[PDB]
Amino acid sequence: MVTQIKNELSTVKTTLATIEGMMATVKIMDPGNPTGVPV
Amino acid sequence: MVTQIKNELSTVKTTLATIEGMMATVKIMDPGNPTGVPVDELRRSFSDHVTIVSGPG
Amino acid sequence: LNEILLPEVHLNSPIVRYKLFYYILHGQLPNDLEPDDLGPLANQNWKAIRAEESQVHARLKQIRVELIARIPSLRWTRSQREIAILIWPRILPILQAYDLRQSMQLPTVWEKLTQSTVNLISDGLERVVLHISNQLTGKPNLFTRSRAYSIPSTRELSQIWFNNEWSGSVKTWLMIKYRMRQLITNQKTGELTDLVTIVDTRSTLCIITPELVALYSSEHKALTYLTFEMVLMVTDMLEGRLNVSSLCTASHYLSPLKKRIEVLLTLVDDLALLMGDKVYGIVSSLESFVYAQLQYGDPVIDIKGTFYGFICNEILDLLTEDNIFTEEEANKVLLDLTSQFDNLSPDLTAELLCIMRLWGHPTLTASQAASKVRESMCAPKVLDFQTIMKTLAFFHAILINGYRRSHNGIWPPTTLHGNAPKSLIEMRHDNSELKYEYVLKNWKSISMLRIHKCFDASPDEDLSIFMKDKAISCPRQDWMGVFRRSLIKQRYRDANRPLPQPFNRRLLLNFLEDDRFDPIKELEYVTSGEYLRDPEFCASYSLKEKEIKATGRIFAKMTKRMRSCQVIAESLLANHAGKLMRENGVVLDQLKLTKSLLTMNQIGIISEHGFEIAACFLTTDLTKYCLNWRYQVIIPFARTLNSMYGIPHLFEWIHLRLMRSTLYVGDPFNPPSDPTQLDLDTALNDDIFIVSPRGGIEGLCQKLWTMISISTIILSATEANTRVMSMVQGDNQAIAITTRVVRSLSHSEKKEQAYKASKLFFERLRANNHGIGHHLKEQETILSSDFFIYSKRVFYKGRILTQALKNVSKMCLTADILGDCSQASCSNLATTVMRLTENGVEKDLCYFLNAFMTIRQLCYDLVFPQTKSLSQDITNAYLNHPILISRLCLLPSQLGGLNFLSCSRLFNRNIGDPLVSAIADVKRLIKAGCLDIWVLYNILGRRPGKGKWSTLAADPYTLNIDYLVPSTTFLKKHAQYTLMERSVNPMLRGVFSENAAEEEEELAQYLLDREVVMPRVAHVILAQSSCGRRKQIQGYLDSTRTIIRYSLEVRPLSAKKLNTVIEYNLLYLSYNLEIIEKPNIVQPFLNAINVDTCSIDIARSLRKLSWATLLNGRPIEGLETPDPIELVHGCLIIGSDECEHCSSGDDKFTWFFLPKGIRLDDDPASNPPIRVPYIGSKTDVASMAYIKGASVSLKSALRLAGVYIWAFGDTEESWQDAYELASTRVNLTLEQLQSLTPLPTSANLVHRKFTPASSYAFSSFVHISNDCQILTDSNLIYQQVMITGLALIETWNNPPINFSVYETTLHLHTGSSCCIRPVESCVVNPPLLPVPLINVPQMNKFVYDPEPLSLLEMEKIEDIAYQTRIGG
Ligand SMILES: [Zn+2]
Ligand SMILES: [Zn+2]
């Protein structure tokens, strides 16, 4: 059952990362605050 | 007890999926200058670049 | 000096309504202008304005009192008079009435001179074309097959050009323009007397001033005022009308269009009188109605007539918006407009796109132009996050796939996001291609994927970008300095503030005069964030000339730092990242561009010679895209481009800077309506201001927008599972939707299936474009199963439709260049006639027209002298003898004449050696009777001019004949040396040298003073040497009218140079007088040369004799190439005919075949299979070792060494000299030079918008085979032969002909021809002169590279050389 929770938390990881990237893109889409790419 | 967190985590998984759904269908809107207020007044924005990392980095 | 800087001859600036209003209110001129018509000018205190500018008021008051005296009823106020005062757009139906036939003699003399000169060459020209046809086909009806009707000769062409309608109007307005320009020159000089001209002709009174023209017609009782710019528009438009009507009268191909064009002109002229400036809306609607009528005959029922009906609705809206016409009247007017477009072939419906500029241009106002951009911008726009992220994911996929297709098939440095699946991790690890179906699935991870630094791009990578002049705006603190001082003086006085300083600096001059200019520090302006804080930044628009559409009526100008940043960013994008996306087909190479366009258009045209293929084409207009781009939709693309280039923040600069600044339209006669708004920041969003524009500007950051559009097109194609071939070009994008259909299906059903397949793709594309914020309307998109539009040219069923009338409408009587020589104008006319030949007009008619208008231009220049001369002996000698005019106009340009169009130019664009072609045409004219053999003897026996070693090598194929180069080129060169010697920039530190001319003369002597002279080799080696690179960089300068004026101001010409530039035309005519007057006494060995001698032999003798002083009898080799027409002895085989060259000995030929049963605009199955025709072959190295990333200097040095070794020898001293000459540009040692240099065998010696060479109507069905031929001069010769044969086949079936009831065969035998010759070269010629002391810009990176090879590269090249030496 632990392997099942690990496999499902992998999906939790990927969907949480998708949400994080989507919110980052949104925040960087405000013309009010100019943004700079690292390096 | 470890059996209890198994079902609760499945509830979390689904909401995270659902939030993603709505987030994927959001609308990015640009206000524009419909009022036509002098730029002097409209100038409420950063003049400085900020090096924030988006997504990977 | 004022006799060089003459006022414009043609229109190049926008027409301003308020300028005319200012000039008619300053003098209190009679007018029926309403108070709102004047706008801000009604509130001016004209008394003070009249008190100042005393001379202007004197002239205007003189014009007013004369108008009152001649017409007493003009005093009648409150419009109680019957005289009507009409502004420009409302005088269209009266322009034929304004005729000063009496009290005007110069146009009459010009017409009689042109007639008498043309009458002496018409029969000779007819014989010339008859002989050309007889040689090229063996039959005398090559040019008259389609028309045989009436065959118009040069005499007929002249008669119908001078006796047409608009001829009297074009003579009257030519006189008006001539007098106005004379008055302007006199006023600028400072005469201040007799500056008012009155013609007082019966029924048409005209008063001309340097600033206004008062025109009154008694027949219509209408009085109008025209400013200088409006006078230039009217005379350009009337010349265009004359040209279009006369060509429709002359050509049997355009004959059906004459009546329709006449009725269209009449109807829209009355509509103009009725409405005013809104008739240009109707004209712009007709612009699209041409395409709407073109798609009215497609097989698909569900797409037939949609655009037609929608455009009819929009024209009804435009006619009923002001309630000028009721619904019935508007419908009747629409029917009258439409009836002129129906029952025409597709070619003619496209050639009704000439009428666009036949009605002039609207009177422009800053407020009206600003309203359109204030609404596209500053407007709320909703966007879809997912649509932006999907197109961003596809953008990343295309970038990665392009970087894989280059750089040895490896992924860019990338960092996968935390959401990436296992499959994406494996594809990154394996460096495998990202299939678009995979991307559409996992678009949440293909995106959010950070591509790291891929390019070692530098701002100073390209120098040509920094040396182009771009309009720059004034600093914000003084933004009112654009406006006229008179209008702003009082409003500034009432504010107790100083008058703003006028701004006249240019970007080029500002960049040239910078002691500390580093492109890295220039880009730091944007990168550091200083641009968003600069209080000096100011951007403004300005009215755009020669535009009739509401959109695109303005162009923007920025400050110097932000223009430099913009050009640097655009260069960075266009060189590294723009190259990575080639999903579209547009490339800088025009040849493969039109080849790709033809292939794209011919997707669905498959014959019967299972499943087949079908195509539905979609055309979208992207003009309003620039105003609709928003930061929120471009920031992710900008961020990933910044990451790939290493810049933290560069490319998302336009929107960020625009939202924080107030824009405005800068027109000197359009000040702000409110005089209390003296600062740009506090301005409101009205009048001429555009407060905080959220969008982008046209042209600015176009690479990023084009890349986003390509990504969106690919996303939409993948979403619909449809194959497409986009051809995005910034303004017009063309998409060829492709689907698979049953072969046995009917053509109509095949096209219906193609449209049904394309429906889903079009819906997806509309949804995607709306998601990224670009709403697609019915006007923009054009869905057709037959044609698409690219670069304003339509691709209809495997053809490019002609649109020759558009080209003929811009064939005027003078060039806009400053020198205003006769040679420049004749060259312009020849270029336009070349366009006419390429666009389907009869080649015989085009040749006759070229001769006629060259004669017409020379006669006009003779009888309308730009500058007064004390001695008129030359002008009288040319005027009193029209035979001299004819001889000069028929003489080819290379020999000193004005005939810039060759007989071979009718067929081949690529001419090779122009002197051989000129000699061939001289022979043709001599044998027909146009010229005389003693003219050829005079040219051969001509005394050598003033030429140096530099002139023989700078431009080969040229003779030592004086005055061959126009004064325009001299002015351009003077401006470039005057700017280069003034340059103090860190870049170009060592480019300029005072003894550069002497060094180039010594180097040209070094290359040329050998046993055999090879001007091609000398030209190449010079162009790839240090001196030649400095010459090239100095030639990178723009040489613009403003730049030329600045050069003449800061560096005045000497008195002798002033006089020679002013009287170049008279000196050139006097120079020709020695050859085109009488038979001179010539040396006797010239009697061996006859009209039967091959043109190559005569070219050899003529170049040997011309440069005799320089070369002392030594020959010139490597130049001559056989003339295309004279090389081939063609034969057309028809039915029972048998080829006469094959039947008699000769067996070398290029076989051409056209199948029978071809019907254009008919079922593709019936006619034979189609294919992309032969349109040309550009350059296509096998070096010892291939170097990757070689610098420009390294490539130039390798080219120099290879050419030197191939031409002069392969001894050890021939290698030492080449090594030194390369050492003027690189730092390699002798061993690696020898090793890296490409093969010195068969050196091509190749040395250096959308204009197709033909319509490719019947040439797409032609079979070609050189199986009976030998086959790098020979390759070019045979390509020329194939092109000539294709053009011959195409002129056999002229555009009037659309069928092929018989199969034809063309042989085109090049064998048994005197012109083809053996080739011997690559002998050892050592240098008879020591190597000159070549000064070298060692420090300058753009000329010399201290480290062109890396340590690893040096090791690899040494290993390769050692392996070759040992391995053998
Ligand atoms: Zn033959
Ligand atoms: Zn020959």
Author numbering:
A (entry chain B): 248 to 286
B (entry chain C): 248 to 304
C (entry chain A): 4 to 151, 158 to 618, 658 to 1228, 1232 to 1299, 1308 to 1330, 1337 to 1433
Study authors write:
To catalyze the RNA synthesis in both replication and transcription, L sequentially consists of five domains: the RNA-dependent RNA polymerase domain (RdRp), polyribonucleotidyl transferase domain (PRNTase), connector domain (CD), methyltransferase domain (MTase), and C-terminal domain (CTD). P harbors an oligomerization domain (POD) for self-oligomerization, and the oligomeric P attaches to RdRp of L, tethering the polymerase to NC to extract the RNA strand for both replication and transcription. Here, we resolved two L–P complex conformations from the mumps virus (MuV), a typical member of nsNSVs, via cryogenic-electron microscopy.
In cryo-EM maps, four P molecules assemble like a kettle spout stably anchored to L. Our cryo-EM structures capture the clear interface between two P molecules (depicted as P1 and P4, respectively) and L, involving the RdRp, POD, PLinker2, and PCTD regions. A salt bridge between P4-Glu267 and L-Lys453, together with a hydrogen bond between P1-Thr265 and L-Asn428, further stabilizes this interface. The POD tail of P4 folds into a β-strand, forming the anti-parallel β-sheet with Lys390–Asp393 of L. Three electrostatic interactions fix both ends of the β-sheet. Furthermore, L-Gln680 forms hydrogen bonds with P4-Met276 and P4-Asp277, enabling close contact between these two β-strands. Intriguingly, the C-terminal domains of P1 and P4 turn to the template entry side. The turning point occurs at the PLinker2 region of P4 and is trapped in the hydrophobic groove contributed by L-Ala731, L-Leu732, and L-Val739.
